[PDB]
Amino acid sequence: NGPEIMSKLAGESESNLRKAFEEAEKNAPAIIFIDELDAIAPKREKTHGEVERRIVSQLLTLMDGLKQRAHVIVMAATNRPNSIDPALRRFGRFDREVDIGIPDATGRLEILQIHTKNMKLADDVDLEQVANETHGHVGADLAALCSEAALQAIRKKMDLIDLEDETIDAEVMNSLAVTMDDFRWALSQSNPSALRETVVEVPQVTWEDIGGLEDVKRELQELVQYPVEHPDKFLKFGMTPSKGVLFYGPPGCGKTLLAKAIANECQANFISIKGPELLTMWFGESEANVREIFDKARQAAPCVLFFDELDSIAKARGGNIGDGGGAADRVINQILTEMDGMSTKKNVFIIGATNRPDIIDPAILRPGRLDQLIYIPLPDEKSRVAILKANLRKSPVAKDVDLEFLAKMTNGFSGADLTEICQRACKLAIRESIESEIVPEIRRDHFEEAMRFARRSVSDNDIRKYEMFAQTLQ
Amino acid sequence: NRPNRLIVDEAINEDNSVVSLSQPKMDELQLFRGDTVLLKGKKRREAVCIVLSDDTCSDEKIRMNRVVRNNLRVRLGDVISIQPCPDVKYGKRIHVLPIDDTVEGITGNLFEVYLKPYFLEAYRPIRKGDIFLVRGGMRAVEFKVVETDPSPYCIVAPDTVIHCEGEPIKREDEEESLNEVGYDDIGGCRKQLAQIKEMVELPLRHPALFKAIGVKPPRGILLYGPPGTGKTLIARAVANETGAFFFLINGPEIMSKLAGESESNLRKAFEEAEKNAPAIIFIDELDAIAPKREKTHGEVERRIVSQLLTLMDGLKQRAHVIVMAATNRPNSIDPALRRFGRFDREVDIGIPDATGRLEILQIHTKNMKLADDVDLEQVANETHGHVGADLAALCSEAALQAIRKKMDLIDLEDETIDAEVMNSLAVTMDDFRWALSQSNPSALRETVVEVPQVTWEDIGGLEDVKRELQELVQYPVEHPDKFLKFGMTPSKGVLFYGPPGCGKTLLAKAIANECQANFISIKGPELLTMWFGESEANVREIFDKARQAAPCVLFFDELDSIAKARGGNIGDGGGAADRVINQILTEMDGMSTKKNVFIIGATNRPDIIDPAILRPGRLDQLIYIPLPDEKSRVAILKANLRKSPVAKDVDLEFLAKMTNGFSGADLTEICQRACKLAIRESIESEIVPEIRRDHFEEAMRFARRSVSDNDIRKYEMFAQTLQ
Numbered sequence A: 001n002g003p004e005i006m007s008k009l010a011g012e013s014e015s016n017l018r019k020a021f022e023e024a025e026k027n028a029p030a031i032i033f034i035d036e037l038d039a040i041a042p043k044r045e046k047t048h049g050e051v052e053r054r055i056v057s058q059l060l061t062l063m064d065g066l067k068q069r070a071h072v073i074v075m076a077a078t079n080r081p082n083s084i085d086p087a088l089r090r091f092g093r094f095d096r097e098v099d100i101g102i103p104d105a106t107g108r109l110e111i112l113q114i115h116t117k118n119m120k121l122a123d124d125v126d127l128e129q130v131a132n133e134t135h136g137h138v139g140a141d142l143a144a145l146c147s148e149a150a151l152q153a154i155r156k157k158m159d160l161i162d163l164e165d166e167t168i169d170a171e172v173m174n175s176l177a178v179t180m181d182d183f184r185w186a187l188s189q190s191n192p193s194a195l196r197e198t199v200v201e202v203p204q205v206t207w208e209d210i211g212g213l214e215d216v217k218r219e220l221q222e223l224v225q226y227p228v229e230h231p232d233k234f235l236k237f238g239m240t241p242s243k244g245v246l247f248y249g250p251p252g253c254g255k256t257l258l259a260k261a262i263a264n265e266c267q268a269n270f271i272s273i274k275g276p277e278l279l280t281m282w283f284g285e286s287e288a289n290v291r292e293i294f295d296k297a298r299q300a301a302p303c304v305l306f307f308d309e310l311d312s313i314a315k316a317r318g319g320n321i322g323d324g325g326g327a328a329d330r331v332i333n334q335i336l337t338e339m340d341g342m343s344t345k346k347n348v349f350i351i352g353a354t355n356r357p358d359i360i361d362p363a364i365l366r367p368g369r370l371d372q373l374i375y376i377p378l379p380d381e382k383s384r385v386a387i388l389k390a391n392l393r394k395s396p397v398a399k400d401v402d403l404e405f406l407a408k409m410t411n412g413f414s415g416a417d418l419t420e421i422c423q424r425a426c427k428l429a430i431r432e433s434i435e436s437e438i439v440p441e442i443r444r445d446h447f448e449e450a451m452r453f454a455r456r457s458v459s460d461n462d463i464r465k466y467e468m469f470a471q472t473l474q
Numbered sequence B: 001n002r003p004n005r006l007i008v009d010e011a012i013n014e015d016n017s018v019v020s021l022s023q024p025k026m027d028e029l030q031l032f033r034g035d036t037v038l039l040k041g042k043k044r045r046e047a048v049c050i051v052l053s054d055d056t057c058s059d060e061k062i063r064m065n066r067v068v069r070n071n072l073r074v075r076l077g078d079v080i081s082i083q084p085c086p087d088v089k090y091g092k093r094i095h096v097l098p099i100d101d102t103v104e105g106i107t108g109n110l111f112e113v114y115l116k117p118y119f120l121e122a123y124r125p126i127r128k129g130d131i132f133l134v135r136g137g138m139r140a141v142e143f144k145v146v147e148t149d150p151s152p153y154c155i156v157a158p159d160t161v162i163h164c165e166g167e168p169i170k171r172e173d174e175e176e177s178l179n180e181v182g183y184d185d186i187g188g189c190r191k192q193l194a195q196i197k198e199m200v201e202l203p204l205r206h207p208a209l210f211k212a213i214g215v216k217p218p219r220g221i222l223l224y225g226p227p228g229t230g231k232t233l234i235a236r237a238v239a240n241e242t243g244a245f246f247f248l249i250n251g252p253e254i255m256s257k258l259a260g261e262s263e264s265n266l267r268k269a270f271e272e273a274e275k276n277a278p279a280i281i282f283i284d285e286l287d288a289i290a291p292k293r294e295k296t297h298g299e300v301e302r303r304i305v306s307q308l309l310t311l312m313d314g315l316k317q318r319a320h321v322i323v324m325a326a327t328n329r330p331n332s333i334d335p336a337l338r339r340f341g342r343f344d345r346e347v348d349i350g351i352p353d354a355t356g357r358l359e360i361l362q363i364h365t366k367n368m369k370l371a372d373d374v375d376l377e378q379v380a381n382e383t384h385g386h387v388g389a390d391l392a393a394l395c396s397e398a399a400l401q402a403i404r405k406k407m408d409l410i411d412l413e414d415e416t417i418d419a420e421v422m423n424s425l426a427v428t429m430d431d432f433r434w435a436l437s438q439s440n441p442s443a444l445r446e447t448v449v450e451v452p453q454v455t456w457e458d459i460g461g462l463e464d465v466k467r468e469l470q471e472l473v474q475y476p477v478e479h480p481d482k483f484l485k486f487g488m489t490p491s492k493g494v495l496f497y498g499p500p501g502c503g504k505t506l507l508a509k510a511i512a513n514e515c516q517a518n519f520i521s522i523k524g525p526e527l528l529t530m531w532f533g534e535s536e537a538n539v540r541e542i543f544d545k546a547r548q549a550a551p552c553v554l555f556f557d558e559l560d561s562i563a564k565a566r567g568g569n570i571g572d573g574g575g576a577a578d579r580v581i582n583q584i585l586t587e588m589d590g591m592s593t594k595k596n597v598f599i600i601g602a603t604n605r606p607d608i609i610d611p612a613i614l615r616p617g618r619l620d621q622l623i624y625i626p627l628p629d630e631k632s633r634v635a636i637l638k639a640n641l642r643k644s645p646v647a648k649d650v651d652l653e654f655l656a657k658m659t660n661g662f663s664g665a666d667l668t669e670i671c672q673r674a675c676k677l678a679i680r681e682s683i684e685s686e687i688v689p690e691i692r693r694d695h696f697e698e699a700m701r702f703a704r705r706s707v708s709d710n711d712i713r714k715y716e717m718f719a720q721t722l723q
């Protein structure tokens, strides 16, 4: 343990590092697990006092003092890869690295089942909702979440039973069952508080959640799927697979869905960097963190790395009017750099998305960075049907509702504009069944009400200004 | 289950002998209201009281004073045997003596100063050997019942006699003091006492249940808040409430010892507690011991941190202890202490608000008599920056300000001052008003978190929006079912817009009061502070307070303030993104949409607001609060003036149509200048407790409208883009 070795007297500790390993050499095969390594050897700038420096240098000697000696392994654990002294990382000492991430909704369910397996849940309890609804938790937070809900059941029920026992009865404790009402309470506590950083997972959304866009679903497949799944031809004919794609178009039309969909299609990891996280690096004047993203994407491979509203920094500085300067800025510069040094033979794949393609820096569109411009436009009447079908699967709509009539009612409605038309009806519905509480369907009279509030966010010039752009692409 | 057995419980009454049971519980026992009962608890003894009609209570459990809980040798969450003892009786003779320690330093007769106001018209059922308590004379004095008539079995009516010889006994180890701390001593804290009570309830009260079941209790508990908030007093109270040995480590104490002599003192401290289990180890100032982040200088200090870490997970089993540490700021601690298994559970004990300050003032004034004019409310309502320990000093100052007025001249020369004067000395409002003039008003000033007082009855007009807010806030917490059924996700926030002064800020505090949530207000100059100061890292610190104060409404006021400062319409060559509003969107997205925190922005310049805030999932719903109408301007003028009692010759509804585009702000000083005129003339002509129309038709001269012809319609030209 890290503190264990550092709480001892200086030189009494040196005993404890030394005699620890040959103790393991006498027992081989053996695994020496160093608990907190960055407590022992966090030397980069740290480096103060004679004793601490000596304990780092001691550990380095013991790592390559492993010569032969039969068979041991040294497994150390640390929070951040960067706190360690790089002299530990050198070959022969800690060469192999594994990244154990936070769990996602798929995995959280496994964790919850592992810790609830000794206790009986009620019939209503479905761990899914608990699993699906805790989006920031690590594993040890779910182990506390399950222990709270258990005692919330005891501080309801057996509290009154008042069994006075030096050994409590077996026949009541077994019989005590935990309801959903408890989990919903434990989720009200502070265990929801958990560590919040880059989400890395496999997106759930499949193509069946995307209406329309029949060409582009294919384009993406031939751009991503082939060069991993047919490496032969690209050697044969010789071409190099493109590194990335840039979506453009009007807002709300599904640029972001397509990205998560192709990641689910191919079972890769999806990393989303949203515009405000690029603007954070721009005001904060730290663009050194762009390098830290790619080194996560590299390590999470296969991955798709999705930069969303990539036009955000060029808008913040004024865009069309802008300042007297040009289109280079320090965050987008730092992307091009980390983009070039990336291995073109690995599986990482970059997707940008922007709805202001004119103000984008022309240096991104050169070959070898983002080659392929794809245009996702306002959907058509055939698609607006598919959109409305797609969104509403969540709520079961009645049959008197003719969507395809509502389709032609909407002209330039984007995939975003239609989604709240569905959602205001979901406000009306929930209202009246509460309103008239003092019916599990949705009726046309809802929609023709919400019709009043329908807006289009895309003007006459906006739609064509995009077209006046794509005509320069002929 | 033999349902004359009930659970003991705390008391909402201070009365020395009273029990609180609701209407059903006395009925299933089939018993009267003014009865004399009997209570047989653990450790074979008993006592008698007067029950009272209760309402709230619970299914079954008995609200009881700490005094009677102490005789019975019982503690909250234990059970007690009541059967009615309707047998009545009247006193002939009582013999009671107090104890030396509680009377130490006093002069003369005991009876009159206390017993004579005490036993009168109570008709209280004394029992023999009963240690009871009386307050007065700027202290508390204990009395025990020694030898008595028809034993034990007594009742005190004027026809009894009393006598006390004047030799006290020396109390023994078998009984526990009332000079110690209990939940009565704590005020302004209910939520946090709640949270803490059941974290420590089962493991302390019932250790063998965990020696059976395989569930793991919490070990570390960490308390927050600025100094003088009562952190030490809350941990010590709980320990003496459950009966667990309370060991106390101090930060400087451990750090003043020699290096390695200290290491002794951390080590031997815990197993000392392991030998005494159940035990609570209270670390006084933890950030004095282990403040390691950058701090980290010298070999010895680093070693003492690492020592404490080892002792926290060296708690493996070992039977049952708890470690409660207190610290000023959560961020000064070394994060290695926070990791699971060491200090996992955190409680935030905030500064008290006006509601709670009154409880604190009453707790510290309860041993002294206030004058009739004194109302602690004004003192409580008028100290807005004080923590609890400032009110404990505020009450001690006012007490001596009464002595350095009055008994200073009395010049009693005593080695033991007289009891008959000190009790008689009463404290006026004139003293409190002075103590509030001293430096104790100085106290710690940071984010106010409370429940707003203003209810809808303080808001005139705005009939739609009062509903809109209710369906936006109230439903998704109070009907989670449907949003699962139909599937929609509840909106996170609202954005008010409109003209200035029309009540955007009132609506916010009102819906927080409506729903009993906490209200956090971030005012525009506090956003501009972060913008000039170039530290937007503090936006993250607000939300982590709002998260922790949940249920909360987080109200950003004049959210247009940074866009105005950089020029707005003209502005600079740049666009609408800036670093503080950016940092809000970020912390907004990462927030749990299933928690109860709810965000309200307000702006009167909605055109210059960054369009990125209005996307779905951030602030969805624009609401427009306009200049009130003649029906409302009546309700406004009615609402403001409740403070002062207006006369009947004043026709407001005539004044209503006089005001056209007067906002809710413009009308408020029309009421206020009349309040200047009034106060003037009654001083002016001093050398009338009404307000007369001649005031108003004077103030009419000074009426202005702050909203021009274009301003009102420019807002409308905005809302027409919203069709």
Ligand SMILES: Nc1ncnc2c1ncn2[C@@H]1O[C@H](COP(=O)(O)OP(=O)(O)O)[C@@H](O)[C@H]1O
Residues within 6 Å of the ligand: A209, A210, A211, A212, A213, A250, A251, A252, A253, A254, A255, A256, A257, A387, A390, A391, A414, A415, A416, A417, A419
């Ligand atoms: N083609 C589509 N199929 C299904 N849903 C869509 C489609 N286009 C838009 N939406 C809906 O619109 C919302 C916003 O789409 P988004 O992916 O944000 O587009 P953009 O990234 O261009 O703004 C999503 O919630 C999605 O449900």
Ligand SMILES: Nc1ncnc2c1ncn2[C@@H]1O[C@H](COP(=O)(O)OP(=O)(O)O)[C@@H](O)[C@H]1O
Residues within 6 Å of the ligand: B185, B186, B187, B188, B189, B226, B227, B228, B229, B230, B231, B232, B233, B234, B360, B363, B387, B388, B389, B390, B392
């Ligand atoms: N919330 C409170 N209620 C009642 N008394 C308080 C409260 N807070 C402080 N006091 C008074 O202040 C004194 C010192 O408080 P203390 O426990 O030292 O605060 P902390 O431990 O947080 O520094 C206590 O004796 C108590 O009488």
Ligand SMILES: Nc1ncnc2c1ncn2[C@@H]1O[C@H](COP(=O)(O)OP(=O)(O)O)[C@@H](O)[C@H]1O
Residues within 6 Å of the ligand: B458, B459, B460, B461, B462, B499, B500, B501, B502, B503, B504, B505, B506, B636, B639, B640, B663, B664, B665, B666, B668
């Ligand atoms: N509808 C109203 N009902 C009661 N008082 C109002 C109303 N509108 C404005 N006021 C008064 O105007 C003052 C300023 O209102 P405020 O909440 O600051 O509005 P805003 O936040 O738009 O400036 C408050 O003191 C309040 O008493």
